Design a protein around this ligand. Structure first.
Ligand SMILES: Nc1ncnc2c1ncn2[C@@H]1O[C@H](CSCC[C@@H](O)CO)[C@@H](O)[C@H]1O
Ligand SMILES: Nc1ncnc2c1ncn2[C@@H]1O[C@H](CSCC[C@@H](O)CO)[C@@H](O)[C@H]1O
Lengths: 280, 286
């Protein structure tokens, strides 16, 4: 017997089987199930995922809130997150416990391809296994038609595309453009940790990337050099990498579409950003 | 793509069987999946029959000699391929779908994202072959995603493989029921296997010691674990030219738990270059 679902209201489920049964029943009624995976502490960046999901005709939006210990006190405002979702007209929140997600501990897991050891995988060599493992599980629990990820974490988005292709998953992966503060800083929960000198310096990540994207008419080296100049003008910004790659994060082609990605530490706060680049 | 019912329909393209499967499921039919590497014998046909008896089912039998679950050199080229016989057997069984993918269609990016099994995969069959079960669970995952069956069928013969498939399915919340089917045996007890064709008359005669030892142990087990294990071992010791790789008594889930009353006794032995497996349910004190 299928759990209670009240249309037009926020329905919250903590049991994987409960959201699974409702998702299945809803799909049979001709809803298209959209999945928005989050780790809570929702800002406008996450709302852009929600709104992207909402605009699909027939959508019912499932937002998972689950702090996945496998990809690591993280920020935790449960009541506030649910209010944001309620305000957005999301009808399903999925809020499992760790015990619910991992009843048998870490046993079978996803091993990502080699890209998981590069870029963000340098400092954190197991982070992406954690991500792909919990993503695969949510996909199987919820069985969405489409799943939504922000372009801000571009490498995560690329690896999710690889997970979906590699395991023949029947879901469309949708990347949603980065939401930015008024000065271009990519929205992130971490931003609140920056002191005022750090927050002023943080602007150099996005400024560096936009410079590069416009410098790119003069070629790949001019793009990279323009980006480095901007980063070089910021104090207290320790660049971990600044790398131009093709859109699938392979080596950058001589001409064509690429992505430029940057990561930097401002004190104890690590920030990432990335931008589309067209070479020449 | 076309699907003619009451006939065997062979699809090579994953997209083709995916479309047909989905179409069938929407029309009411329940999809049964029986994954094989071909070279079918009566053991595989019990799997088919178990699938076939599920009411309203359509049966998909996949045939794919999965390069990822083989080590080098060596073994992959040596696995028997008898596809004419296979398809004929499936037709004779009233199976409606054979799925026969190419390596390129399954591994267009080579080994990129893969399944990493739990620690069980390092044990028993995994000992000499530490990448073996990653290969199996990777292809089984992909098959379940392509075919999206209601239930998937595996033999008890490869009992550790069954256990790990159950782990895959639990751990990744796969929406499929795993059905284990009892081992089909020759008249004397020899567990049916594609490997048996590599036993000459003498080795074939000796090979009965595997099932003899396990059934003796299952009967001796009223007298406890030591008695069960020592009975099996005596039968194996008395068998000409059987080299035992392992004989282990484990809990039914094979994992980080002690044996109590209920267990599984598993044997692997070499007859010349041919490596044979068998296992049996054990009840201690029963
Ligand atoms: N500023 C932003 N703009 C757009 N998307 C964003 C932003 N900030 C965060 N997100 C997006 O919000 C999601 C964060 S939680 C991801 C869960 C996954 O790891 C599995 O556990 C992710 O899709 C970010 O890329
Ligand atoms: N004698 C038997 N009785 C019952 N089932 C059997 C027997 N012999 C083999 N099988 C069963 O036939 C299947 C072999 S193909 C497994 C495919 C996997 O590695 C990924 O490609 C397996 O379910 C055996 O346990």
């Amino acid at each position: 017997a299928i759990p209670a679902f009240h249309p037009g209201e926020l329905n919250v489920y903590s049991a994987p089987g409960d959201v699974a049964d409702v998702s299945r029943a809803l799909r049979l009624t001709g809803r298209r199930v959209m999945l928005v995976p989050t780790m809570g502490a929702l800002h406008e960046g996450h709302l852009a995922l929600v709104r992207a999901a909402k605009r699909v005709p027939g959508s019912v939006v499932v937002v998972s809130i689950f702090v996945n210990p496998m990809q690591f006190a993280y920020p935790r405002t449960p009541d506030d997150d649910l209010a944001q979702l309620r305000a957005e007209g999301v009808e399903i929140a999925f809020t499992p416990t760790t015990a619910a997600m991992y009843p048998d501990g870490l046993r079978t897991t996803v091993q990502p391809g080699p890209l998981a050891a590069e870029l963000e995988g340098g400092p954190r060599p197991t982070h992406f296994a954690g991500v792909l493992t919990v993503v695969l599980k949510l996909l199987q629990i919820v069985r969405p038609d489409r799943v939504f990820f922000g372009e801000k974490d571009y490498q995560q988005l690329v690896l999710i595309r690889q997970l979906v292709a590699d395991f023949n998953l029947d879901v469309a992966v949708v990347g949603v453009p980065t939401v930015r503060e008024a000065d271009g800083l990519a929205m992130s929960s971490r931003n609140r940790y920056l002191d005022p000198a750090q927050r002023a310096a943080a602007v150099a990540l996005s400024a560096a990337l936009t410079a590069a994207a416009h410098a790119a008419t003069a070629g790949a080296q001019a793009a990279l050099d323009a980006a480095r100049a901007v980063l070089d003008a910021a104090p207290g910004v320790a660049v971990d990498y600044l790398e131009l790659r093709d859109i699938g994060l392979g080596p950058m082609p001589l001409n064509g579409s690429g992505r430029l990605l940057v990561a930097a530490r401002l004190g104890t706060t690590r920030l990432l950003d990335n931008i589309a680049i067209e070479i020449g």
